């Protein structure tokens, strides 16, 4: 979220 972004892909 501070890395991948709120718009980034879902992740475990």
């Amino acid at each position: 979220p501070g890395e991948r972004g709120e718009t980034g892909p879902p992740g475990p």
Partner: antibody
Amino acid sequence: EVKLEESGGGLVQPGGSMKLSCAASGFTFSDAWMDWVRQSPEKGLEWVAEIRNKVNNHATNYAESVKGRFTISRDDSRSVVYLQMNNLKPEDTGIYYCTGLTFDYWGQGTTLTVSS
Amino acid sequence: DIVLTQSPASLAVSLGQRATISCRASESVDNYGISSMNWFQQKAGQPPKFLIYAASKQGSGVPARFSGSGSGTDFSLIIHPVEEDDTAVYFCQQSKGVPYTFGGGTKLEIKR
């Protein structure tokens, strides 16, 4: 405030090369996943390429239409992302945006025109 | 590739009314119990601006009047109340997996 600045667009002959680059500030750069997205009247918004953070091994991914020709990289020490584009074609023409935190933040864009 | 199809193509709404824009995916964008569907606003001469993520959740700092809904293949962006400044092209976009893909955009016009 977050700030992204693309550079190095312009004109180039079909078959030629071009290296775009993107300067980012306002967020922890080495943590961020960064992408390039392009926009044309013909194809709309196209995701072009992804580079992930240090934790994800700086993994890269590309759109099918650019694989083998485009390469995305980053210099975490300078807070910059590059996009090397080789063997350019007329349909590669468009506005190229550098995005940060996947698509949370967008640069103003730089224009690439492939024409003789 | 997941193909996103928007409707309507464009739309004209009066100030204070509701605008509803749809987005349909060719296959499910659900993954890890989250619908990976985002919405962007593009004003004229501007980059796209991030509004909604995970189908229904508002982006950090985004105004109250933009909200989203849906899951699986059918989603929508709702704007209520519509304002002068909301004239723009709205895109849906899918981050379930590579390649990430955008819709064709929907043009909102304000009636006056």
